[PDB]
Amino acid sequence: DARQRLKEVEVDDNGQFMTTDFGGNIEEQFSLKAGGRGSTLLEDFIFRQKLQHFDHERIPERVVHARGAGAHGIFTSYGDWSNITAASFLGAKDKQTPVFVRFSTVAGSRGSADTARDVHGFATRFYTDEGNFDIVGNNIPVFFIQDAIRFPDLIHSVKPSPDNEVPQAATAHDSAWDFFSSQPSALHTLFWAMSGNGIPRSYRHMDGFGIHTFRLVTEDGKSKLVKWHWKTKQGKAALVWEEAQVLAGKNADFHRQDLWDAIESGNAPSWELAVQLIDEDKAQAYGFDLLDPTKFLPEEFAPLQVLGEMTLNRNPMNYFAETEQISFQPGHIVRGVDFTEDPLLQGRLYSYLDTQLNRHRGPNFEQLPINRPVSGVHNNHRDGQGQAWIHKNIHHYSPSYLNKGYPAQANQTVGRGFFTTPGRTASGVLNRELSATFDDHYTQPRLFFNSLTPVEQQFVINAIRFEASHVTNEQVKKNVLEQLNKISNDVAKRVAVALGLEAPQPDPTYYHNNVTRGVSIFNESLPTIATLRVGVLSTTKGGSLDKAKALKEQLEKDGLKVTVIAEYLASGVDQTYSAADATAFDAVVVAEGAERVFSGKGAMSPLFPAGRPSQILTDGYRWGKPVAAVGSAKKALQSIGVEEKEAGVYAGAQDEVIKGVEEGLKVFKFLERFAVD
Amino acid sequence: DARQRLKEVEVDDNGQFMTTDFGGNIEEQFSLKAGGRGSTLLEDFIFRQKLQHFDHERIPERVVHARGAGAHGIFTSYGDWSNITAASFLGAKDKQTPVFVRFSTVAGSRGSADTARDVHGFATRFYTDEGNFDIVGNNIPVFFIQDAIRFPDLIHSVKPSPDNEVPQAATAHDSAWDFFSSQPSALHTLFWAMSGNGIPRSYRHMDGFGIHTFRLVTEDGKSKLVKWHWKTKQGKAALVWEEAQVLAGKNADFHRQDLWDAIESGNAPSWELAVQLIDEDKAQAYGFDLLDPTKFLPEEFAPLQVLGEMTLNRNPMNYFAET
Amino acid sequence: DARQRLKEVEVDDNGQFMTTDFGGNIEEQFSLKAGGRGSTLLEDFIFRQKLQHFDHERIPERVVHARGAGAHGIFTSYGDWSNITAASFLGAKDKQTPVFVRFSTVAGSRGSADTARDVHGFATRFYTDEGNFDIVGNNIPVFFIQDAIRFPDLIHSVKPSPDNEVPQAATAHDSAWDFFSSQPSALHTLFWAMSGNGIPRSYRHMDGFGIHTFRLVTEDGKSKLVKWHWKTKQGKAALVWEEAQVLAGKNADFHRQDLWDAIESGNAPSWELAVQLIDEDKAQAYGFDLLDPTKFLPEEFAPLQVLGEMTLNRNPMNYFAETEQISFQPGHIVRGVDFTEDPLLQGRLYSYLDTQLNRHRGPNFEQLPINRPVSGVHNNHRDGQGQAWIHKNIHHYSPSYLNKGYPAQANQTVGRGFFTTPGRTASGVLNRELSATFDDHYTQPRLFFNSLTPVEQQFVINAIRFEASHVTNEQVKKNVLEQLNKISNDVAKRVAVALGLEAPQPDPTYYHNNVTRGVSIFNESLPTIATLRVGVLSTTKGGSLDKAKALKEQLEKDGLKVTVIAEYLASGVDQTYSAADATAFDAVVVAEGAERVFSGKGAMSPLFPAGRPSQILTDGYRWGKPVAAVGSAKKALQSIGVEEKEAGVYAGAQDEVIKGVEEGLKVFKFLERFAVDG
Numbered sequence A: 001d002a003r004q005r006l007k008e009v010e011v012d013d014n015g016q017f018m019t020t021d022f023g024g025n026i027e028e029q030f031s032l033k034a035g036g037r038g039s040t041l042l043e044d045f046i047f048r049q050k051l052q053h054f055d056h057e058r059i060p061e062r063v064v065h066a067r068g069a070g071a072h073g074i075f076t077s078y079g080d081w082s083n084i085t086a087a088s089f090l091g092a093k094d095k096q097t098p099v100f101v102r103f104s105t106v107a108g109s110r111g112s113a114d115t116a117r118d119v120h121g122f123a124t125r126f127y128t129d130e131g132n133f134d135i136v137g138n139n140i141p142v143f144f145i146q147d148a149i150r151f152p153d154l155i156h157s158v159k160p161s162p163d164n165e166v167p168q169a170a171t172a173h174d175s176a177w178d179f180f181s182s183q184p185s186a187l188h189t190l191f192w193a194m195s196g197n198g199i200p201r202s203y204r205h206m207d208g209f210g211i212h213t214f215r216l217v218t219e220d221g222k223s224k225l226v227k228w229h230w231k232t233k234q235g236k237a238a239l240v241w242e243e244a245q246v247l248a249g250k251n252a253d254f255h256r257q258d259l260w261d262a263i264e265s266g267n268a269p270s271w272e273l274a275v276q277l278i279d280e281d282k283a284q285a286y287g288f289d290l291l292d293p294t295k296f297l298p299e300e301f302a303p304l305q306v307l308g309e310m311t312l313n314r315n316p317m318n319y320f321a322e323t324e325q326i327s328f329q330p331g332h333i334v335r336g337v338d339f340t341e342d343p344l345l346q347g348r349l350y351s352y353l354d355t356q357l358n359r360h361r362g363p364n365f366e367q368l369p370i371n372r373p374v375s376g377v378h379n380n381h382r383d384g385q386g387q388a389w390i391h392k393n394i395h396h397y398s399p400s401y402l403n404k405g406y407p408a409q410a411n412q413t414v415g416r417g418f419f420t421t422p423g424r425t426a427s428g429v430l431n432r433e434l435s436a437t438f439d440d441h442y443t444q445p446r447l448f449f450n451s452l453t454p455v456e457q458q459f460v461i462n463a464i465r466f467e468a469s470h471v472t473n474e475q476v477k478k479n480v481l482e483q484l485n486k487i488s489n490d491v492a493k494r495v496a497v498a499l500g501l502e503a504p505q506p507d508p509t510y511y512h513n514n515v516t517r518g519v520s521i522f523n524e525s526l527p528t529i530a531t532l533r534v535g536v537l538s539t540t541k542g543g544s545l546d547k548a549k550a551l552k553e554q555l556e557k558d559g560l561k562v563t564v565i566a567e568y569l570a571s572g573v574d575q576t577y578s579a580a581d582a583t584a585f586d587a588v589v590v591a592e593g594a595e596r597v598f599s600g601k602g603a604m605s606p607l608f609p610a611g612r613p614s615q616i617l618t619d620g621y622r623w624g625k626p627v628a629a630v631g632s633a634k635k636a637l638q639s640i641g642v643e644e645k646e647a648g649v650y651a652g653a654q655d656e657v658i659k660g661v662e663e664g665l666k667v668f669k670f671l672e673r674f675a676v677d
Numbered sequence B: 001d002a003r004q005r006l007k008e009v010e011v012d013d014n015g016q017f018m019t020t021d022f023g024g025n026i027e028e029q030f031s032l033k034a035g036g037r038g039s040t041l042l043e044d045f046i047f048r049q050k051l052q053h054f055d056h057e058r059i060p061e062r063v064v065h066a067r068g069a070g071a072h073g074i075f076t077s078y079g080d081w082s083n084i085t086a087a088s089f090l091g092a093k094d095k096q097t098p099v100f101v102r103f104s105t106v107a108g109s110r111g112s113a114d115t116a117r118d119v120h121g122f123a124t125r126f127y128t129d130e131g132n133f134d135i136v137g138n139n140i141p142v143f144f145i146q147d148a149i150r151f152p153d154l155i156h157s158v159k160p161s162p163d164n165e166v167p168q169a170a171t172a173h174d175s176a177w178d179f180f181s182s183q184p185s186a187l188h189t190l191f192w193a194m195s196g197n198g199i200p201r202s203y204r205h206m207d208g209f210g211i212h213t214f215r216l217v218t219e220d221g222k223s224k225l226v227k228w229h230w231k232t233k234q235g236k237a238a239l240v241w242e243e244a245q246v247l248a249g250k251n252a253d254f255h256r257q258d259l260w261d262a263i264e265s266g267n268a269p270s271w272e273l274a275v276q277l278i279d280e281d282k283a284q285a286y287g288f289d290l291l292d293p294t295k296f297l298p299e300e301f302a303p304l305q306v307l308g309e310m311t312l313n314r315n316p317m318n319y320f321a322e323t
Numbered sequence C: 001d002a003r004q005r006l007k008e009v010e011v012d013d014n015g016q017f018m019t020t021d022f023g024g025n026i027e028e029q030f031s032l033k034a035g036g037r038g039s040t041l042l043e044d045f046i047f048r049q050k051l052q053h054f055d056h057e058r059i060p061e062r063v064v065h066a067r068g069a070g071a072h073g074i075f076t077s078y079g080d081w082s083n084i085t086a087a088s089f090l091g092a093k094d095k096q097t098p099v100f101v102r103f104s105t106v107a108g109s110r111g112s113a114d115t116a117r118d119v120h121g122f123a124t125r126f127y128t129d130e131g132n133f134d135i136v137g138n139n140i141p142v143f144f145i146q147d148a149i150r151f152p153d154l155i156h157s158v159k160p161s162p163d164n165e166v167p168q169a170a171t172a173h174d175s176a177w178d179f180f181s182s183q184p185s186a187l188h189t190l191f192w193a194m195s196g197n198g199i200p201r202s203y204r205h206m207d208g209f210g211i212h213t214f215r216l217v218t219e220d221g222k223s224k225l226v227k228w229h230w231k232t233k234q235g236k237a238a239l240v241w242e243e244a245q246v247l248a249g250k251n252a253d254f255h256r257q258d259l260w261d262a263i264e265s266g267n268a269p270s271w272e273l274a275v276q277l278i279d280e281d282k283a284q285a286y287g288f289d290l291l292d293p294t295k296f297l298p299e300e301f302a303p304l305q306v307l308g309e310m311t312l313n314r315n316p317m318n319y320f321a322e323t324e325q326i327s328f329q330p331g332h333i334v335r336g337v338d339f340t341e342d343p344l345l346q347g348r349l350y351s352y353l354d355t356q357l358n359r360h361r362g363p364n365f366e367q368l369p370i371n372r373p374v375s376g377v378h379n380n381h382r383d384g385q386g387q388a389w390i391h392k393n394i395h396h397y398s399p400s401y402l403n404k405g406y407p408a409q410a411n412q413t414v415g416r417g418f419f420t421t422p423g424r425t426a427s428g429v430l431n432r433e434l435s436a437t438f439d440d441h442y443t444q445p446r447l448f449f450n451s452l453t454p455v456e457q458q459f460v461i462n463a464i465r466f467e468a469s470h471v472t473n474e475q476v477k478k479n480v481l482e483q484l485n486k487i488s489n490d491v492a493k494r495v496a497v498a499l500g501l502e503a504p505q506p507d508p509t510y511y512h513n514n515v516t517r518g519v520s521i522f523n524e525s526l527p528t529i530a531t532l533r534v535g536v537l538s539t540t541k542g543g544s545l546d547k548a549k550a551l552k553e554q555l556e557k558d559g560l561k562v563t564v565i566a567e568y569l570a571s572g573v574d575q576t577y578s579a580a581d582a583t584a585f586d587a588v589v590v591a592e593g594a595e596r597v598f599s600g601k602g603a604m605s606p607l608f609p610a611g612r613p614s615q616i617l618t619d620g621y622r623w624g625k626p627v628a629a630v631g632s633a634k635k636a637l638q639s640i641g642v643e644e645k646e647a648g649v650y651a652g653a654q655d656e657v658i659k660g661v662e663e664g665l666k667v668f669k670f671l672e673r674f675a676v677d678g
């Protein structure tokens, strides 16, 4: 159990009498009053201690990535990697290390929807036997800006307008696209966020990236430049925007529910930890500067090397104590890893330590159960708010005769101490500048766009079309068109159509036709359909329910999660039509006999909104899902003008429908259903 | 201008050079580095003062009613009500008092949707010449529970399940209806929340209520029991649930945007302040106890007497500092 | 070991390599720099995690009683007291409960002197098996004010002037005596603070008082009114003001070091817990209202009944984590005890809970090791800053079908719950008033003053003379005299002399000659001299040192702490004359031979300030200590004008001096040496 160290702080209230927070059994369902209909007494200590704790429950949300969810797991190393890193957690084959991972959006506040379009966080803590090591990454390999001092500018522009705090969890407003076009480094991450990466199907269907180049360091000090990669074993999958919008309202918790359900059902998600390793003398040899976080390294130049595997298999017991309180830091580094001069990374190190003082209102946040390491803490730190330990060493300073030299110093040769990469030098003048090697903001956005399928490209175009059409200021829209045109004239032209503007003339300076593998989502089918969801549209009249039950049993043998839907909660029915929506499902199937609720009064019961079954089938079809109908339920497909010989549409006998649905779920999205310019 | 008194704390940055928070002009678009492709220096006081303020921007959300929005306005008294209260802001015909009103839901956190089904807050501050007077009310005249010591139980049961923090801004889950059925006092407010009051068209189309019976006291100390009421001059209007669900995704800001646009276009919304006035010896006359916040007083027994009108006609300038 | 439960949060760093707070071995004696003489890098994560923790070490001091110290110990019940209370820590003979006690002054901030003149705090936590029970008491049985809403007024007036923050830890300034005379209820505690209770010899030599009337309640709801008393087994003892003033500078830590030394040396101090018990119908029976905390109940009307004894035998390991962080509350009440309508106690219940929010900046301060109960916490409280537990019950509300009714309600009949005294009632109008039964502010100050010895009375007079003479405003000094005159025309007259004013004519409304027992300090010799300190003035030249060593050996046989003083740290010398002062000792003894440093060449060494040996002996004599000289050292006594026949002065052979000093230490202070008016 990855949560094993946390059991000593678990509190079981089963079978017990209510108490105060300082002990003593109580009743706390009535205030103490002076007389039968009298005023409440200030001497009611029970009331005030109970209400004080309630009054003080909230702590500040994270300044970014406030909306997210997490889980525990285990990381297993595939080998003894000591030839590239002294990192203990990578030091032996089959070596296991506990982890906790939090996934998140970026812009929205604590209660914003999971399926907003956004960059997504992917933060991993390794509780190594040599200290906590955090990889604080995103589901996108590049970031918007090249210097950490610009982060408040980026975040202010994306977050809601400060006059009215509109809009929530959205880049589709004037200030974001003003910044995107005034700071053209942003264009690469922008294109990624406008692709499927901005609207993933679930946390389990995302890749992860450290973005920055780091260093792996061996015991003698030999270093390699490294990029961290998480490769989902579930396959990458994304929604379509019109679907994600409705899902934002029908289930704001879609992604955290998905992760919770997969772990609880015994379908733990996994990721492989992989690296690109680069010689120090090739930092600038691949057409860009590896210190520049707006660029990724094409895998053709450096293929991935697989270090091990992470599997998340334990949900938290208390969300707040665990998920909400955990404090990630890119400064959480261990021996065998070092930083680089990435000016974005450089400033993060300050900012994540400092922000914990705001969120936790004290300096002892590392003493919280979720933040504690497993490898033991020995230093001369004392006091501060909420100090939870009692230190024995009376001589809390160094150097010292009285403490016999303990706690002792550790370095590269003694005590397995951290050490900075020995060959690292500084040269030149102190400067408030960025290297001229950072200057190309358009080539890799073009490279990224080139590497998507044609409909995938149309999705990016249509995201930019939807977003920029919310920009009220006309000159900002023209500013956006001018920047997009530097990436591709065709992109600028197709976006310009939607804005009623004229696209500029071609500016070929950064145009090119190069492509790179691995950045697409829709060009690859899924490696497994386990945990994917099927909505079975049935009805309580006739034999439809009996057939739906049998249909559900066969589908479940493939590991599918099946919801039988009917007008009310009869036996065998998992969900009502009133509560049902196509956004919850990966496939939609009409059980035989249920065609009766797609027309007439059968479609107008007081038990659900008019047209609800037809809307579920229409939504599922238009959003590209596998849709099907058993036997006589083909009438439901006909009722919405859908024909069986279309891709992703299945009809016939129950055996055929099951095989087709299970096959179509591998394709996941049927892109034949989306027009291209 | 209702915001007049706030002019003295407003900060204009037009045409200005950038500074630190202790003065002195700066640039803050590049970190100071030790060489051309070098590391950032600790002695970059500009970076750290800028990022420290960013790192510490957030404060805890309200424990309840975290999602909401507000506006400034003016309350005007229709008469000299000294015969029923010594309250200065009600003491003369046409006397004007600045107000600020914040509307809200209850259960959802800061970024949850406006069109979630919920009780709605309707909280008014009168900046009177004898102190701030707050009517902290809802759009429903009755509350779930009868004793304040039970508020953490109600809220915990309605807010997300504490293992997975699901579901956001919704009573449609096990713990909420476990509480509603275990604490039957809650059934009255539940029915109101299940009605159109739970999914109103806009803040401007809500009535407001103080819920509790208070007292109005004259100079000589004679008292009347009183219920506060806000009657919308816009009329009450509600969505249908299947529409509110989609709208929650298509525009989570529907209500705060609606209030903002109405003020910005010059269509300031208005509410009449009204009271029900009850003699002390009638506290238990109408089939219930007027100390019981799970009951409202039927207007057949005590009509609404209009005292004045409130108009909200100025949006905030900075949402965080004000709202 | 009373600290046994705390052992699981103790951290041992011996034998270990240095780490960060998130693990990983490090070195932290050099900042990471860009080149040989280069600037420090922001990526030095080691530097910042270490300095951030240092930068945030301090928490707000207590708004009052900021200066203090404490210890762990054990309370032992002497009986099964179920006949008077349901409280479980008093429910069986020989039942043991861990305790932690903090002693304190009131006005001074954290670094102020122990021996400032002040009311003193005496706060005890019983970690009972039915929750933490706190008796938050003082070393004086009455308080300044009758309603808690006036506490910010009282404290603001006593604490430093808000323009310059002068004076530290002192009531000797205009605002305090303006308040004392404008708010005459304050006069009773004022008189106690002007007596020996204001300048005690140590924490171990104080009695303690809960002050308020509380209620004890049996299982069936029967209640008795109660006053809590702590009776020191070490005996009460006080300094003199002119000595406490020098002691404030020579050793600001006098009291906290005294308590620490006594415990580490195996001389654990003890107090008996005793109560006064009176029926409900006595609340207004004794010429005052028992809801009034400016009055005490004379023992002649209700005697002390001892319930048990507390012994403090374990020092803290980390002062900050244990002593600084502990959070007392009079609202920390258990089944078997209830409050009364004391308007001062009523407001305290709110104040102590709320103030923890400022000190600990979070709602979860009860989870701190020193604050945790031993009996178990089970409720539906969740989250909060710094939440240290992981709750398993996901149905965190009541009532509920899904949690099967757990945690379950407890009351008088089920689950040994707390219950308010069943018979308490309210009657009358809501009011912002005090009962007219609170109106007498002068009878009990007079009773207190009448009950002191004559020299003990001079000490009260001379403390008021000292303090009132710092008041610059003439009308305030007059206001003080008119208020003093209502207590005693003689007190007012003798105080008026020092102020150069005319005391008012007699105002006999409240005058009386009644006396009461138990309030004096100097009318009783000490019951033990264990831990008391003897300074032995010697010299490195001659054979004085060898005799002083033999003198030290015999005195330590009687349990005394002996310090041999000489010019330098020779073999057998505990302290140099440069470092020595009379305030540190309860008795001063010149060893034979040491007369050479009281005159001539021996008195003018560069190793100590001029006249230092003579000043130590002079101070000890005039501050009333037993002083002595062995053999030829009687020259030192003659060199300061002191003669053999005086009380508390001893000379002769070593055996004679040792016997005389040890019996004089029980007298403790020789009041023959202080002039009385007249």
Ligand code: HEM
Pocket (backbone or CB within 6 Å): A061, A062, A063, A064, A065, A068, A102, A103, A104, A120, A121, A122, A123, A136, A137, A138, A143, A147, A148, A149, A151, A210, A211, A212, A293, A326, A327, A328, A344, A345, A347, A348, A351, A352, A355, A356, A359, B051, B055
């Ligand atoms: C490669 C660039 C970046 C990545 C991959 C990234 C990723 C993340 C992630 C995943 C989180 C949430 C961790 C969690 O789940 O609790 C987070 C939070 C945060 N980030 Fe970043 N971020 C980047 C850039 C920056 C920069 C440049 C700054 C400021 C200099 C910054 C400041 C913060 C802060 C203050 C938090 C709040 C963390 C907390 O409150 O615990 N980030 N970031």
Ligand code: HEM
Pocket (backbone or CB within 6 Å): A051, A055, B061, B062, B063, B064, B065, B068, B102, B103, B104, B120, B121, B122, B123, B136, B137, B138, B143, B147, B148, B149, B151, B210, B211, B212, B293
């Ligand atoms: C008639 C019953 C109630 C009504 C009408 C009501 C209404 C409101 C409203 C409108 C707000 C939001 C104020 C704003 O917009 O800033 C609020 C917040 C709040 N309420 Fe209530 N509420 C009621 C019951 C209670 C009870 C019983 C408690 C606890 C004893 C409580 C505790 C709170 C707290 C702690 C806040 C947060 C205020 C802040 O952080 O500024 N409420 N309530």
Ligand code: HEM
Pocket (backbone or CB within 6 Å): C061, C062, C063, C064, C065, C068, C102, C103, C104, C120, C121, C122, C123, C136, C137, C138, C142, C143, C147, C148, C149, C151, C210, C211, C212, C293, C326, C327, C328, C344, C345, C347, C348, C351, C352, C355, C356, C359
């Ligand atoms: C009979 C009257 C009183 C007695 C015997 C008394 C005693 C004490 C003692 C011994 C302490 C120090 C506790 C410790 O060692 O940490 C203390 C602190 C304190 N007292 Fe009182 N006091 C009295 C009156 C009051 C009143 C009337 C108030 C306010 C209404 C008050 C508010 C406080 C506060 C806020 C603290 C700080 C507690 C903390 O920060 O933990 N006291 N008092």
